[PDB]
């Protein structure tokens, strides 16, 4: 064989170009920097009203409004300062696994097992919430709707491919293929020109939303990657597996920066977020809890413990003023 | 309180939204959500005919004051088992495996590994699993081909119909690691009339009344 030999030596000697220029681990440099202690965060607001498991949640762009999508076919937009429900949207299919908020507060996209990413319009002239556009064209279940503008949305799916749509016409504009299993998550970059996606084949990959380019791949886990987010400056990102490992990869250094596991942990990570300074890597877990890892020393600097079921969604605001968590016991709790 | 003239109306809107949410959660809790599963080429366009009549495929029928929604397996393709955690809180898992499963050609290792998988999954090991062995048109005409040494080394004796059916039942209970929570409801019938709906009406009202007992804390 010839191309197999060339691809084998390509992967091994590009990994050798990574290893020979690999200087040191992150903790080797940041070891002398002092810790942050115990971040005892308290439940300020408890948002009740859902009557089933809560699967995903997205903050508003003004750090005050929330969407939460539940299993009983309800999408609720919360005013998170007075714990008031701004909107309640009855979905068509109650098998909703993800939801998103527009960065202008106008639209809201939500989807799931019926392979259709619905996009709803809140700021109407009639005072209800009508379905603006149902993006159909996926052949399996949907995850991580993520709004770019009011006319442009990325959606991951179980079709081993993600898709950049176009809400005006309604057709799948760009198609990102390259995974070998269900793609469970994606997270938009803060400059809204890149994204990363993690899939069930124990891998993530960094894609460009402009060219449809498979720019980078990222391995290191043993199991599926369940959720994903970016470091808030858009140069690193942390994934969470069912390996009970959160991992921080750098987009430029092409390997994992550092691992965020503890030996006492039994079960795997369901959600991952970040604080606004990029210091508190939060992580919701499958037992009951959330853990607030100090993102430079990998020490659990606090445990958010309410949540009589498994935590399913995390979100930190644009200013960093709160952490909303949501779990299968139908309660979002806000932690400050 | 210290609310303005518009915050009181925002609070009134939020309370009305709460009212609508729980008055439809009443109906969303008083409806029978049945997951539906089966093996490869088992026959499913003959029991969905029997009831009172892409992504997930949902089938409605209202039978004897009970609104049955049935969510089928014939919509999804990904067997990574990532769609199973959405299906907790279902009333029953209507499983359909027939006796002609070894026609399309080993069923033993894959079937018992799937059942050890759902007895490994924490979600399906506490939910009731209704079983159907429905027809009597070909269940007797293919047992008498030969002894069952070709794919099934668990048994090496004489193979009649109903004694081997009881043997399949007894090895099906051998698949269960813990019968302390889940409860199997097997059915050996003639799929001729609405006898097939009276083992998903009775075998699900038993689960309804068991959940009502253990939500009273009574038994």
């Amino acid at each position, epitope marked *: 064989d010839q191309l197999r030999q060339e691809a084998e030596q390509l992967k091994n000697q590009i990994r050798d170009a990574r290893k020979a220029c690999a200087d040191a681990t992150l903790s080797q440099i940041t070891n002398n920097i002092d810790p942050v202690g115990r971040i005892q965060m308290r439940t300020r607001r408890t948002l009740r009203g859902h009557l089933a498991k809560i699967y995903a949640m997205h903050w508003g762009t003004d750090s005050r409004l929330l969407v939460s999508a539940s299993q009983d076919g309800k999408l609720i937009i919360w*005013d998170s300062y007075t714990t008031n429900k701004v909107h309640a949207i009855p979905l068509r299919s109650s098998w909703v696994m993800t939801c998103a908020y527009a960065p202008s507060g106008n639209y809201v996209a939500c989807g799931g097992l019926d392979n259709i990413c619905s996009i709803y319009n809140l700021k109407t002239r009639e*005072g*209800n919430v009508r379905v603006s556009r149902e993006l159909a064209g996926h052949t399996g279940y949907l995850s991580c709707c993520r709004f770019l503008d009011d006319n442009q949305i990325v959606t991951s799916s179980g079709d081993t491919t993600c898709a950049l749509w176009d809400i005006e016409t309604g057709q799948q504009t760009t198609t990102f293929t390259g995974h070998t299993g269900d793609v469970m998550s994606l997270s938009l970059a803060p400059d809204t020109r890149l994204f990363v996606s993690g899939a069930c084949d124990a891998s993530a990959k960094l894609w460009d939303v402009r060219e449809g380019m498979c720019r980078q791949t990222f391995t290191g886990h043993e199991s599926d990657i369940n959720a994903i987010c970016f470091f808030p400056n858009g140069n690193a990102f942390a994934t969470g597996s069912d390996d009970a490992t959160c991992r921080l990869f750098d987009l430029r250094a092409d390997q994992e920066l550092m691992t965020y596991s503890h030996d006492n942990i039994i079960c795997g990570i369901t959600s991952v977020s970040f604080s606004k300074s990029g210091r508190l890597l939060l992580a919701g877990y499958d037992d009951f809890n959330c853990n607030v890892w100090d993102a430079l020393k990998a020490d659990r600097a606090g445990v958010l413990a309410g949540h009589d079921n498994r935590v399913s969604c995390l979100g930190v605001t644009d200013d960093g003023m709160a952490v909303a968590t949501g779990s299968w016991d139908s309660f979002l709790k806000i932690w400050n | 309180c210290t609310l303005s*003239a518009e915050d009181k109306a925002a609070v009134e809107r939020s309370k009305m939204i709460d009212r609508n949410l729980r008055e439809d959660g009443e109906k969303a809790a008083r409806e029978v959500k049945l997951l539906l599963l089966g093996a490869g080429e088992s026959g499913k366009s003959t029991i969905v005919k029997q009831m009172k009549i892409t992504g997930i495929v949902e089938t409605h029928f209202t039978f004897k004051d009970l609104h049955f929604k049935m969510f089928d397996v014939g919509g999804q393709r990904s067997e990574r088992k990532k769609w199973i955690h959405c299906f907790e809180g279902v009333t029953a898992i209507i499983f359909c495996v027939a006796l002609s499963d070894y026609d399309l050609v080993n069923r033993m290792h894959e079937s018992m590994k799937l059942f050890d998988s759902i007895c490994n999954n924490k979600w399906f090991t506490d939910t009731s699993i209704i079983l159907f062995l429905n027809k009597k048109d070909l269940f007797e005409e293919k047992i008498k081909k030969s002894p069952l040494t070709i794919c099934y080394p668990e048994y090496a004796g004489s193979n009649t119909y109903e004694e081997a059916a009881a043997y399949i039942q007894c090895q099906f209970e051998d698949l269960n690691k813990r019968k302390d929570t889940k409860e199997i409801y097997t059915h050996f019938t003639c799929a001729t009339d609405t006898k097939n709906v009276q083992f998903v009406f009775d075998a699900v009202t038993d689960v309804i009344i068991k959940n009502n007992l253990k939500d009273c804390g009574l038994f």
Partner: single-chain antibody
Amino acid sequence: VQLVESGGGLVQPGGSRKLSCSASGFAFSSFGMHWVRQAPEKGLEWVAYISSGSGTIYYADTVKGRFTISRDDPKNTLFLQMTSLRSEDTAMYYCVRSIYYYGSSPFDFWGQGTTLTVSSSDIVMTQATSSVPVTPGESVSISCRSSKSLLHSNGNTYLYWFLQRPGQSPQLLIYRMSNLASGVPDRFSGSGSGTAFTLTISRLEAEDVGVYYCMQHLEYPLTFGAGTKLEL
């Protein structure tokens, strides 16, 4: 969206009348409804309010207990039943929708109004003039003053700038201080603090003339300004 009222006409004193506000084009069961009135060549005056689901009902203290408010939600018809009518109840009555959540524009669409003619503590808001002459192309500033500080502890300053072109119904321009309404031209702007509130109109076109108004929410009853009329 089309709010349209019916029930106007001439009545003698001592009688009792009823107005209907038929809505066509929106979700009437999700909107609170104000009744506003306007005396001939004097100015606006708020009358009554009913929230969504008929729970909260407020009136103005002039006719509190003398009017009543009715509502039909699966028929979209809003009623005001007036019990006794003096020579001050004669007005053009408007039927205004209002939705209250975080970020709404709660005096957005005004109905067409209906004429009713009868034969023969509270916050005071003061507007400075009654006629200002100007030509197009000239940026104009209007101002009005309030009794209390309208700046609540939330941060919201519950002041509303409306415009009534001659022969028309009013139209929301500014709903708290610096928030433009739904699809008004973006040459308008509002500013001020606490008690002094100014509306600046740059690049003034021809159809921007008409009687301007400033209103406070903050507390019931709602009180309108006197009404500055831009002249050309």
